[PDB]
Amino acid sequence: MKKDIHPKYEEITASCSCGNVMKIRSTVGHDLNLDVCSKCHPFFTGKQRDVATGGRVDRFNKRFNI
């Protein structure tokens, strides 16, 4: 890379709510606190839940009994 034209690119630490401490090289400078990472993202549980059609006959039979 060239010398002067580029921004400062320094290794910092990014910790998350799941405690995923990860050291990366970045242009942030300061340390970073995340909210969700790929470890704690609900891609492996929430997307399983996320179809959510629901039943019409079962809602009907749910509302009462004959």
Partner 1 sequence: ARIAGINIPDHKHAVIALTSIYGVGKTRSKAILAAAGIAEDVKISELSEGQIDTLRDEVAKFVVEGDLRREISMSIKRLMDLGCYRGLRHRRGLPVRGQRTKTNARTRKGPRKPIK
Partner 2 sequence: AKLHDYYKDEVVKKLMTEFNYNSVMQVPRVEKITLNMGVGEAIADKKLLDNAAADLAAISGQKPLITKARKSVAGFKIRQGYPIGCKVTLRGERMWEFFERLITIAVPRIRDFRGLSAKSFDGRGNYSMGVREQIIFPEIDYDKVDRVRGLDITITTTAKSDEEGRALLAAFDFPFR
Partner 3 sequence: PRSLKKGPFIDLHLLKKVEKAVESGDKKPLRTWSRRSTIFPNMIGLTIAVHNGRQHVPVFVTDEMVGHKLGEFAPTRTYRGHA
The residue ranges that bind RNA (CB under 7 A) are 59, 63
Give min distance, CB of 11 to partner 1, in A. 22
Of the candidates 31, 34, 26, 33, the residue with the CA atom closest to the CA atom of residue 9: 26
**23 by DSSP, 3-state: which?**
strand
Interaction pattern, residues 4-43, with partner 3; x per rule: CB under 8 A:
----------------------------------------
- Cβ proximity of 50 and 33 under 8 Å: no
Residue 9 or 13 with smaller CB distance to partner 1: 13
Structure token pair of residue 22: 């990860």
63 binds partner 3 (CB under 8 A): yes
The kind and range of the H/E element at 63 are helix 56-63
- Tell me whether residue 37 is annotated as binding: yes
